[PDB]
Amino acid sequence: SEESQAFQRQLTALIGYDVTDVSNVHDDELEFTRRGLVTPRMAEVASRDPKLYAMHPWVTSKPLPEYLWKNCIFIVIHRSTTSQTIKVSPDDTPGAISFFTQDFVLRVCGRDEYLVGETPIKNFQWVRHCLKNGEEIHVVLDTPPDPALDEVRKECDRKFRVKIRGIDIPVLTVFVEANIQHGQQVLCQRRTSPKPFTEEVLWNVWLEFSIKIKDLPKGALLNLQIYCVRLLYYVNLLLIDHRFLLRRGEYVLHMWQISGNADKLTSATNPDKENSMSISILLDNRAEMPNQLRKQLEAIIATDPLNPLTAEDKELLWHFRYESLKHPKAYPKLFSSVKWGQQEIVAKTYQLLARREVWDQSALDVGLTMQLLDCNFSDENVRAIAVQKLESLEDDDVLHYLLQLVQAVKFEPYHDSALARFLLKRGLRNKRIGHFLFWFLRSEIAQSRHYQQRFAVILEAYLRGCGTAMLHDFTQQVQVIEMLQKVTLDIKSLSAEKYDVSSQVISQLKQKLENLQNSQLPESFRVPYDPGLKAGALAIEKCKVMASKKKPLWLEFKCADPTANETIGIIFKHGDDLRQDMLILQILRIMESIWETESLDLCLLPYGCISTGDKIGMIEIVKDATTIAKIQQSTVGNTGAFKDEVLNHWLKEKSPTEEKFQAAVERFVYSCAGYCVATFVLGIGDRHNDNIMITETGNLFHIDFGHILGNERVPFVLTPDFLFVMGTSKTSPHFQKFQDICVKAYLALRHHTNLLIILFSMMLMTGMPQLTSKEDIEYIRDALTVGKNEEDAKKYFLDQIEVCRDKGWTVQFNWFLHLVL
Numbered sequence: 001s002e003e004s005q006a007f008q009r010q011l012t013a014l015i016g017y018d019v020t021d022v023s024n025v026h027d028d029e030l031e032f033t034r035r036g037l038v039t040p041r042m043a044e045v046a047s048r049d050p051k052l053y054a055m056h057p058w059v060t061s062k063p064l065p066e067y068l069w070k071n072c073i074f075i076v077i078h079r080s081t082t083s084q085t086i087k088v089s090p091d092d093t094p095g096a097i098s099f100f101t102q103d104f105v106l107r108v109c110g111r112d113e114y115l116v117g118e119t120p121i122k123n124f125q126w127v128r129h130c131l132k133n134g135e136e137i138h139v140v141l142d143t144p145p146d147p148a149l150d151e152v153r154k155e156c157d158r159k160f161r162v163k164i165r166g167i168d169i170p171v172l173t174v175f176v177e178a179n180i181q182h183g184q185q186v187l188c189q190r191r192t193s194p195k196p197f198t199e200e201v202l203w204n205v206w207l208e209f210s211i212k213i214k215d216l217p218k219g220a221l222l223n224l225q226i227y228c229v230r231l232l233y234y235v236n237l238l239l240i241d242h243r244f245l246l247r248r249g250e251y252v253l254h255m256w257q258i259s260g261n262a263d264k265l266t267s268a269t270n271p272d273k274e275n276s277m278s279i280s281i282l283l284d285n286r287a288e289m290p291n292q293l294r295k296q297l298e299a300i301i302a303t304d305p306l307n308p309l310t311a312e313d314k315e316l317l318w319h320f321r322y323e324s325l326k327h328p329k330a331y332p333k334l335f336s337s338v339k340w341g342q343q344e345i346v347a348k349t350y351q352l353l354a355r356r357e358v359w360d361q362s363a364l365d366v367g368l369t370m371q372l373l374d375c376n377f378s379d380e381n382v383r384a385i386a387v388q389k390l391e392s393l394e395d396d397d398v399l400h401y402l403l404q405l406v407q408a409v410k411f412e413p414y415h416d417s418a419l420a421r422f423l424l425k426r427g428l429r430n431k432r433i434g435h436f437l438f439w440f441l442r443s444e445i446a447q448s449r450h451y452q453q454r455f456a457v458i459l460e461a462y463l464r465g466c467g468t469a470m471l472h473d474f475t476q477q478v479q480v481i482e483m484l485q486k487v488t489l490d491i492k493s494l495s496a497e498k499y500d501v502s503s504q505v506i507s508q509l510k511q512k513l514e515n516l517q518n519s520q521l522p523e524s525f526r527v528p529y530d531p532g533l534k535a536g537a538l539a540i541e542k543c544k545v546m547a548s549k550k551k552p553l554w555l556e557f558k559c560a561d562p563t564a565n566e567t568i569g570i571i572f573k574h575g576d577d578l579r580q581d582m583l584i585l586q587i588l589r590i591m592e593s594i595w596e597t598e599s600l601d602l603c604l605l606p607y608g609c610i611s612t613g614d615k616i617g618m619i620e621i622v623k624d625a626t627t628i629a630k631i632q633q634s635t636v637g638n639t640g641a642f643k644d645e646v647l648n649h650w651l652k653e654k655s656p657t658e659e660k661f662q663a664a665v666e667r668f669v670y671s672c673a674g675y676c677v678a679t680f681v682l683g684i685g686d687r688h689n690d691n692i693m694i695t696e697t698g699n700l701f702h703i704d705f706g707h708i709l710g711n712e713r714v715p716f717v718l719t720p721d722f723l724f725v726m727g728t729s730k731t732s733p734h735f736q737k738f739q740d741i742c743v744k745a746y747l748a749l750r751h752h753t754n755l756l757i758i759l760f761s762m763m764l765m766t767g768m769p770q771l772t773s774k775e776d777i778e779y780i781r782d783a784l785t786v787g788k789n790e791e792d793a794k795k796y797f798l799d800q801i802e803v804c805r806d807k808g809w810t811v812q813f814n815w816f817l818h819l820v821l
């Protein structure tokens with residue numbers, strides 16, 4: 001159809017990739033996947049409530065914590081010019097919320113966030129946020145949005161052998177290494193005779209392996225590698241395809257080049273055919289356990305996810321697999337003990353999987369679930385049982401792991417998978433999940449050519465069922481970004497190099513922002529990091545180019561909804577991959593919930609940050625906040641010392657009331673404790689004063705994580721100015737509190753060691769490609785003191801605090817001289 005052509009044209013603009021393209025393929029996997037996702041799309045579209053999808057009530061079933069609990073809490077309903085307070089019991093349905101003492105709904109003031117459905121007000125994420133900061137709950141009696149706006153446009157036994165013709169490069173010795181991989185485990189490997197490196201190196205070599213055709217497991221990768229000795233080029237091909245048929249025929253595969261990882265596992269070939277290297281291949285093919293052994297595997301199950309299993313361990317786990325099955329924590333270890341290169345062994349594991357019973361009855365463990373979704377597991381059925389457990393997560397918990405789950409797709413062998421279908425279902429059901437799903441997929445499609453083909457199919461399938469409302473919303477969202485991306489790169493051409501922001505560039509920037517406003521930007525656009533907020537017109541006078549080396553843009557927007565007078569601030573940055581920052585901030589958000597289960601709040605500030613395109617994205621501006629280095633630069637001198645007194649001086653100046661100051665010191669103790677614990681675990685503690693900020697209310701927060709993780713020592717920044725606020729020159733009543741929170745927070749994280757280990761490794765494998773080392777990943781274990789006693793590990797973190805005390809401003813001065821030398 002004629003309208004069908006305009007629809008795919010609209011979709012592509014929003015995706016950032018033409019899905020219809022069949023140039024960089026050698027199979028129909030992606031088209032089969034495009035058609036395959038039509039059924040679960042229409043399934044979830046036809047299942048979802050139309051009225052509830054339009055309003056998306058953000059509700060948690062998690063209990064109200066002891067710190068937030070401290071009956072009858074008041075709210076203020078608005079309509080016309082009316083403004084009246086109402087005493088509400090925590091257990092009260094919005095439909096039951098007493099106003100007549102009926103088809104009008106209670107909307108949040110300034111936001112699209114709704115207080116709707118059959119759930120208590122104490123269970124709403126908005127009400128809980130207002131109790132955390134200590135803010136008033138303001139509501140508006142508005143007409144519910146019409147679900148008509150959310151309408152969807154209709155419509156043998158022999159040994160395996162591979163023939164290698166040769167290699168061709170457009171521009172001293174070289175050879176091909178062919179590996180058969182299943183869960184990063186090499187089943188068999190053969191190499192070619194090293195011939196001299198030239199534009200055309202031919203061999204005509206039949207590489208016959210030991211593995212039989214029947215023995216080949218579904219999801220096995222033929223990893224072809226070009227050496228010299230060091231690796232230069234890599235390419236993969238699935239030995240058994242998406243139709244369970246074995247691969248046959250000629251293949252001219254374009255390889256990826258190494259620089260110096262999940263990217264190393266991709267089933268996609270290089271798109272740049274003009275510059276990349278090609279490789280031509282040819283295919284034509286029940287008494288139960290004694291006490292000591294019982295104690296032996298009980299110790300094996302008890303070990304961490306990074307502790308390696310030996311042949312002795314693997315053999316014991318397989319022999320006593322039916323005993324192992326009773327323990328759900330043994331499942332990743334047990335499926336790592338499987339001889340995947342044997343059809344008979346694989347067949348036994350499938351029978352073992354049928355008797356899931358206890359696994360299906362187990363209380364959901366996310367750390368255990370995601371361990372089965374990493375690079376070690378290439379089995380469709382093994383991974384399926386993990387996705388099975390993810391179904392029981394309510395939408396709030398799905399949001400918590402959405403970014404990590406989206407990155408986990410890189411570990412799936414085939415494009416169409418149970419996880420890819422799950423993310424699709426969960427996104428199409430809840431508007432908030434769908435919004436972030438769009439931006440998480442768009443970020444990968446824009447700066448990852450190894451995975452853009454797969455993710456684009458997933459995103460297209462989401463957009464095809466999300467509804468015209470969210471579509472004509474993502475359109476005005478992408479528009480704004482592309483326009484601002486064009487403005488930042490223009491300033492960057494005038495902008496240095498060295499050394500400071502021009503007087504003329506800020507006026508030339510304001511002119512470009514005044515030029516753009518007249519015709520380009522729609523009246524309003526939804527904030528990507530915060531979907532509830534609708535930002536309208538620019539405050540051109542409040543806009544500037546930041547002093548930072550990458551020249552980011554300090555933008556200020558007026559709020560579009562009249563129900564809200566403070567501006568919306570966005571930092572637009574080019575030159576860096578913000579996917580790195582996003583991941584740290586998401587772990588920081590997870591750590592906050594880990595402390596919520598232990599009834600602790602360490603006032604962390606994981607600000608809004610979304611990578612929107614290629615090496616460009618946007619950051620939330622935390623209002624009334626300033627840099628630690630800026631405070632030390634305010635009172636005195638050039639550099640160094642860094643007078644202990646200066647930190648408290650700013651806090652006493654930026655707080656009028658002593659009740660507001662003793663609240664500002666109170667907030668600082670918890671935030672400093674939280675950021676010391678978090679950065680120590682993640683291994684990003686040693687920062688520069690410039691990358692650490694504080695609000696006028698005393699809340700401390702770290703910024704620009706890409707700078708540190710994208711590159712004598714101190715384990716976390718705890719300087720004498722921070723110690724001065726506590727009242728220590730020694731120990732004070734506020735310092736006793738600091739160490740008390742520091743230990744309680746560190747030990748609480750240690751009760752979720754397995755989760756923090758798998759989130760960390762998956763982060764280093766999908767987010768940052770130069771860390772990617774067995775040596776780099778093992779850090780998390782040492783920081784989390786894996787194996788040590790609770791009182792022993794307590795003394796370990798307290799000794800880290802004492803290092804920071806014995807180091808003074810030494811490192812800070814050394815950092816100040818470094819960013820100057």
Ligand SMILES: CC(=O)Nc1cn2cc(-c3cnc(N)c(C(F)(F)F)c3)ccc2n1
Binds near residue numbers: 548571573620626703
């Ligand atoms: C009032 C104010 O200056 N607020 C403020 C500044 N600020 C700066 C950031 C920030 C975070 N990550 C970054 N990479 C940057 C950057 F602009 F690039 F330097 C800045 C985050 C929150 C934040 N809040």
